[PDB]
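Run log // design_07
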């Protein structure tokens, strides 16, 4: 329960503190030569930070939507080898890939083979989404250092550091979700395989 609740808490505090930050940036977008130069650089930094934060937010939101649909998959046809096999029997792979990968005489062994294939494909989809998330995060995260180097009072800095800590927390939580999907698939594959060997043991006798 801590998982779901903690994810929602992390999300909320991230969104609120992010909106606060954007407000404070806005505020400076509103309100000697070296003075002009410095203030202009502060503005440029603000623009860059705004972009960076925008990308981070878009990535988090993509991940959460994905978690929704992916949770739907793991509650239906990926919750048991039973349902995986039933799903594959109703929705078989293309005849091409079928005979390329699982050209087997035994039609039960064919289902098991297609089941493993399907698991591998979902695995691949998830690793791909995770890699995209990690890349967006790593590419854009350090963009928050402006928020500290341009801080003035120790308090203001502290609050910015906390903000960043919250971003890192939320990314950590999302990562945990991705990795657990893959683990659940690993376990599913082992039960599927053990089920197959139980089938062979019962069949020979």
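design_07 sequence
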């Amino acid at each position: 329960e801590d998982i779901t609740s903690g994810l929602k808490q992390l999300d909320s505090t991230y969104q609120e503190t992010n909106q606060q930050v954007l407000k404070n940036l806005d505020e400076i977008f509103s309100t000697n030569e070296m003075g002009e130069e410095d203030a202009l650089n502060i503005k440029k930094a603000a623009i860059a930070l705004r972009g960076d934060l925008a990308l981070l937010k878009a990535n988090f939101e993509a991940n959460e939507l994905f978690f929704i649909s992916e949770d739907v998959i793991f509650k239906t046809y990926m919750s048991s080898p039973e349902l995986l096999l039933t799903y594959m029997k109703i929705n078989p792979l293309d005849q091409n890939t079928a005979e390329q990968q699982c050209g087997i005489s035994d039609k039960v062994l064919v289902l098991y083979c297609e089941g493993k294939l399907k698991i591998e494909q979902e695995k691949q989809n998830i690793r791909e989404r995770l890699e995209t998330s990690l890349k967006a995060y790593q590419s854009n995260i350090g963009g928050t250092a402006s928020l500290i180097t341009a801080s003035q009072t120790l308090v203001e800095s502290l609050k910015n550091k906390n903000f960043i800590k919250g971003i890192r927390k939320l990314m950590l939580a999302h990562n945990k979700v991705f990795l657990n999907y893959l683990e659940e698939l690993d376990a599913l594959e082992r039960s599927l395989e053990q089920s197959k060997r139980q089938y062979l043991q019962e069949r020979q006798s």
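Residues 1-205 form a domain with the Methane Monooxygenase Hydroxylase; Chain G, domain 1 fold (CATH 1.20.58.1660).
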